[PDB]
Design a protein around this nucleic acid. Structure first.
Ligand code: K
Ligand code: MN
Ligand code: MN
Ligand code: ZN
Lengths: 341, 618, 117
DNA sequence: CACAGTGATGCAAATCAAGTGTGAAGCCAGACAAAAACCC
DNA sequence: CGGTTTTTGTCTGGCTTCACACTTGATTTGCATCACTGTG
DNA sequence: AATCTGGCCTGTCTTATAAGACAGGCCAGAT
């Protein structure tokens, strides 16, 4: 795990907390710019390529049949296998939460310039309320595909929300949401095991199971050291969801997850306490029926990272994380690093 | 022993010296005034004084024989504090020193002024909304509220880098009306109406919002805020009452652009260009305002409940802010108007014939068109179709023209034409940057010799005021060789000075009716002058504000009656108070500066306190 | 004060007058005349020597409606008179010893709004 | 060891308001005499 | 060093006017307190 | 060999002294 400083181009300002990175065939792309898209890049999506520790953000264009989604902070993002990306929830530049779901897919790749398709998927049934800071993952059970969505936050409901606390947020009800992309329906399951609301947790999905790690529960204000397994069965009848608590769970909120090899992932970053960053890193080894969380060697953090109050980042995909910490102000607002594995 | 002065002697000693004149006066009293020596000496002294032009002593002695005590009511003291700009800590020094030299407590101590304040600030008077306001709390004791409005600040969330405080929109308006109460009563009286008449009043409110630069950050613990502030203010413009089938102008602001009547509603330390934080702070304000569009405020004035209906007009915005909050592109764009769909090129070819088509409603539609792309169009075609509306509006403004910013950007254009006329660009197309720099230097030196104008870095209100005269064109003409172009300049400025009073005066219909009449005629020759004798600059392009000024001024005038009174200039002049108050009238610490300024800025805008200063001039 | 010889003279004359005429109220402007004539060389020596003794003596000397307690107090005043500083001590002790003061405070509550307006 | 503020807070500290005979102080009256400055 | 010119008082009974008596629970004031300001 | 791209730059543009919009030259890399 080698840490590396990164320089940024003229449009460094776009990069903010809550941004997202998507991987299409090794080419990384960037989404969720600060402010609304400007005439320099109307889509708000950028080809994000670091060459010799210098990052250039270059505008990407959309297909004629694309939606022009708003920039979204803290959406639930997922990869679908023909490779495509799911974006659900998030905050808009106007601080609204969007219930809409967008699918990002490569339309054309002529001469190493990529056109994207951004289509909106309508959702009926038990649609999850607008959310940020929540996870969405795709499971495979008995030759069937199903989407799972758990946790997060939203504003108070229209009946109780008052302008004096207009921005107050509360954890969504911790209902697991099965979401079939083929039909556009969503099914809600209440479980006894998932009693508290949870946001900014990590989600790792293998076959028919999704693990829920860390996170923060607003009511309790606790970053619980619990691990939750959620198994989904896809028989010919209505699917069934079973949850199991498994002790030995990490205590971290807003952690970042990257895949080093098949069936092994690294969990870095995030916070153990409001004022205490989580400097340690954990290695997760998956078994068809078992999950293994191991302490691993901490990286050689610089004195900036050690003493920053906040840090943010996302996974670039090839087992390399892109990190950002608040920088000096007159200069550039943020300082960026790339940690490889 | 030489006779001392009579005033030095002891009582017993001055008695001996006047006992010869004392017995002489007792006689005069019994013979003439019935032995009332007290009254005859009191009058002989008082008259002796005024004989030596010493009226003050005599007048005070009069007031002390009458014996009436002297002292200012706290609410009087508050008005003197608020309106003479004194700080409490300076006022306390005055108060203290007055009480110790006169022995009398002429001014009241601070705790009482601080009690008088309570009436004039939001949260004090009770009210109610029928129907109740949507998503608003119905508490009526809500003064200064935290401007983040419960914004989430845990370390997982988006970083909170601003401080803000505000009043709740209604509770503010209420305290606004109650300030105007005495002025509202008289407005019915001088309209020959019943004082106690309580019909459905209507309050038209001007809304204003600006961003400020160069707001120094305090040391000390707190959010690492930016060095910019944002202000949201409202002015009460007119109150009409419905008496029969007439709308009776009970009240109309005499000075619509004065710092005095602009009311502070929201102070934040934040950058207007930072959309994320701007919407976060102001969205609770726009919801409270939305709610009040569909309710009537029942409020009790002088023992009689009255009802008020509210019309909100956002017109104290500059073009850059308008374009930000209504989802339009920035102002380089080819979509140059915020009032119409015209394109920069088109505005240069047609110039005058364009009607007001944009609106907060339409943009909101167009954004949703943008985001959804229903005709599965290309992004050029999409943008054409939505005429550049490519973000989601979040504040509703009037489609209008700010006069101040209109006056400014126009003069700066003329300042440029002046330069390009010195360099004879009308004849010689190309010129080096060094050649241009000296045209500006020439003109700058000359505006100093002839017009006493020192050069300034950014264009001014007053500079524009004083540059856009015909005397200045005389000045600038001395520099240009050809008198065929002295004529073009002179006419261009004549047309502009015939037009200007329309879009700057409070009531053009009353104040320059002929200029309002001819506006469509003069604006056509101005446009044609630019199109012929100024091809070099205005072929294929025109400035945003030349378009607004040449195409939409008459329509706006007939829709609203005025442009000049809905200008942001009152808001701008309020900024001057922001700066002064933040230094000299607020606790000097990161967690108090914003509320202390908000509060004490409100008092400075209280007509009830202002009246006490005009009390001499009955 | 320090007394001159003539002043001791006048004081002694006043004493003689009071012992000769006990029921008699002297006039001042006439008494000054008659004393001044009596003063205007051996009689006066006694007073002259008395005055220096008085000088030595001078040397030595050189070196809004009312509180509920007020409403209660005013009524109980006549009984204490039957029984100012002493009266108020008694009034305060008995008031302190006393739902007892709820009615006087209700009267004061009615009077508080009237003071305010 | 710069220095005079920037406004709200909250705890001393002082004032209030009433009940009414206490002595203390200044005062008037006429006439005259102490003291304390000025005219060789 | 008196001669001479003004301050200052005595003497007295009784005239007014006033503050001072003490207590109790509120109001109204006085004042130090906090962490920062700007001119460099 | 040519062309048409499309990105990068500088400059001037609103409006307005720090940015965003836009045009147009400049040249390398495809059709
Ligand atoms: K002004
Ligand atoms: Mn502005
Ligand atoms: Mn401004
Ligand atoms: Zn227009």
């Amino acid at each position: 795990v080698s840490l590396q400083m990164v320089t940024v181009g003229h449009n460094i300002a776009l990069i903010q907390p809550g941004f997202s990175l998507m991987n299409f065939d090794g080419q990384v792309f960037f989404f969720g710019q600060k402010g609304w898209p400007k005439r320099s890049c109307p889509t708000g999506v950028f080809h994000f390529d670091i060459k010799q520790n210098h990052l250039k953000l270059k505008p990407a264009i959309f297909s004629k049949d694309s939606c022009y989604l708003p920039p979204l902070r803290y959406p639930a993002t997922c990869s679908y296998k023909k490779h495509q990306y799911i974006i659900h929830g998030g905050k808009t530049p106007n601080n609204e939460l969007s219930d809409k779901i967008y699918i990002m897919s490569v339309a054309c790749k002529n001469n190493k310039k990529v056109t994207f398709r951004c289509t909106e998927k309508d959702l009926v049934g038990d649609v999850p309320e607008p959310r940020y800071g929540h996870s969405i993952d795709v499971v495979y059970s008995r030759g069937k595909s199903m989407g799972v969505l758990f946790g997060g936050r939203s504003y108070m409901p229209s009946t109780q929300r008052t302008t004096e606390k207009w921005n107050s947020v509360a954890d969504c009800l911790p209902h697991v949401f099965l979401i079939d992309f083929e039909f556009g329906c969503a099914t809600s399951y209440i479980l006894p095991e998932l009693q508290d609301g949870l946001s900014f947790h990590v989600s790792i999905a293998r076959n028919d199971t999704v693990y829920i790690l860390g996170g923060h529960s607003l009511a309790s204000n606790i970053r619980p050291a619990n691990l939750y397994r959620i198994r989904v069965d896809l028989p010919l009848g209505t699917p069934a969801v079973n949850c199991t608590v498994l002790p030995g769970g990490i205590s971290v909120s807003s952690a970042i997850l990257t895949q080093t090899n098949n069936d092994e992932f690294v969990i870095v970053g995030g916070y153990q306490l409001e004022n205490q960053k989580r400097m340690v890193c954990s290695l997760v080894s998956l078994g068809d029926n078992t999950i293994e969380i191991s302490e691993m060697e901490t990286p050689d953090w610089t004195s900036d990272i050690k003493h920053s109050k906040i840090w943010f980042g996302s996974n670039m995909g090839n087992g390399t994380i892109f990190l950002g910490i608040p920088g000096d102000n007159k200069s550039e607002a943020f300082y960026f690093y790339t940690l490889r594995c | 022993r030489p006779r001392q002065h009579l005033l030095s002697l002891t009582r017993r000693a001055q008695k001996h010296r006047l006992r010869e004149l004392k017995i002489q006066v007792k006689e005069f009293a019994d013979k003439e005034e019935g032995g009332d020596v007290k009254a005859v000496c009191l009058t002989l002294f008082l008259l002796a004084l005024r004989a030596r032009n010493e009226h003050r002593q005599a007048d005070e002695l009069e007031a002390i024989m009458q014996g009436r005590g002297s002292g200012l009511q706290p609410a009087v003291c508050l008005a003197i504090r608020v309106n003479t700009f004194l700080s409490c800590s300076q006022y306390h020094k005055m108060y203290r020193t007055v009480k110790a030299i006169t022995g009398r407590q002429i001014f009241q101590p601070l705790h009482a002024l601080r009690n008088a304040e309570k009436v004039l600030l939001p949260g004090y008077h009770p009210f109610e909304w029928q129907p109740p306001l949507k998503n608003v709390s119905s508490r009526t004791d809500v003064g200064i509220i935290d401007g983040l409005s419960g914004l989430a600040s845990s370390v997982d969330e988006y970083p909170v880098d601003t401080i803000a405080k505000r009043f709740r929109y209604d509770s503010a308006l209420v305290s606004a009306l109650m300030d105007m109460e005495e002025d509202i009563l008289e407005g019915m009286r001088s309209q020959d109406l019943d004082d106690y008449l309580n019909g459905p009043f209507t309050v038209v409110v001007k809304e204003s919002c600006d961003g400020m630069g160069d707001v120094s950050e305090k040391h000390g613990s707190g959010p690492a805020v930016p060095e910019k502030a944002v202000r949201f203010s409202f002015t009460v413009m007119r109150i009409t009452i419905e008496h029969g089938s007439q709308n009776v102008k009970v009240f109309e602001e005499p000075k619509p652009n004065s710092e005095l009547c602009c009311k502070p509603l929201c102070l934040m330390l934040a950058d207007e260009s930072d959309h994320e934080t701007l919407t976060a702070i102001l969205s609770p304000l726009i919801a409270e305002r939305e709610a009040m569009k569909s309710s009537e405020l029942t409020l009790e004035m002088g023992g009689i409940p009255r009802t008020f209906k509210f019309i909100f007009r956002g017109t104290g915005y500059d073009e850059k802010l308008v374009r930000e909050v209504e989802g339009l592109e920035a102002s380089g764009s080819v979509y140059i108007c915020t009032l119409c769909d015209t394109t920069r090129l088109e505005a240069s070819q047609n110039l005058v014939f364009h009607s007001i088509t944009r609106s907060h409603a339409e943009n909101l539609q167009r954004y949703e068109v943008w985001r959804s792309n229903p005709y599965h169009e290309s992004v050029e075609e999409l943008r054409d179709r939505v005429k550049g509306v490519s973000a989601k509006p979040f504040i509703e403004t009037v489609p209008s023209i700010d006069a101040l910013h209109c006056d400014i950007g126009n003069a700066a254009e003329f300042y440029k034409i002046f330069q390009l006329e010195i360099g004879e660009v009308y004849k010689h197309p190309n010129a080096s940057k060094e050649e241009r720099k000296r045209w500006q230097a020439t003109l700058d030196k000359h505006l100093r010799k002839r017009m006493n104008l020192k050069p300034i870095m950014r264009m001014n209100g007053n500079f524009a005021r004083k540059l856009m005269t015909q005397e200045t064109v005389d000045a600038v003409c001395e520099l240009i060789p050809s008198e065929e172009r002295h004529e073009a300049l002179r006419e261009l400025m004549d047309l502009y000075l015939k037009m200007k009073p329309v879009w700057r005066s409070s009531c053009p219909a009353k104040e320059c009716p002929e200029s309002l009449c001819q506006y469509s005629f003069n604006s056509q020759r101005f446009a044609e002058l630019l199109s012929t004798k100024f091809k070099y600059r205005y072929e294929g392009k025109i400035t945003n504000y030349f378009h607004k000024t040449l195409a939409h001024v008459p329509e706006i005038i007939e829709r609203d009656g005025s442009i000049g009174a809905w200008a942001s200039e009152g808001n701008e002049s309020g900024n001057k108070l922001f700066r002064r108050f933040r230094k000299m009238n607020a606790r000097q610490s990161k967690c108090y500066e914003m509320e202390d300024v908000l509060k004490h800025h409100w008092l400075y805008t209280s007509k009830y306190l202002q009246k006490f200063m005009n009390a001499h001039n009955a | 004060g320090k007394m001159s010889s003539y002043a001791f003279f006048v004081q002694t004359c006043r004493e003689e007058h009071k012992k000769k005429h006990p029921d008699a109220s002297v006039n001042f402007s006439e008494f000054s005349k008659k004393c001044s004539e009596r003063w205007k060389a051996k009689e006066k020596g006694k007073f002259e020597d008395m005055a220096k003794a008085d000088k030595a003596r001078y040397e030595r000397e050189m070196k809004r409606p009312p509180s509920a307690f007020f409403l209660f107090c005013s009524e109980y005043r006549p009984k204490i008179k039957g029984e100012i500083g002493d009266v108020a001590k008694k009034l305060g002790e008995m008031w302190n010893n006393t739902d007892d003061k709820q009615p006087y405070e209700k009267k004061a509550a009615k009077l508080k709004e009237k003071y305010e307006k």
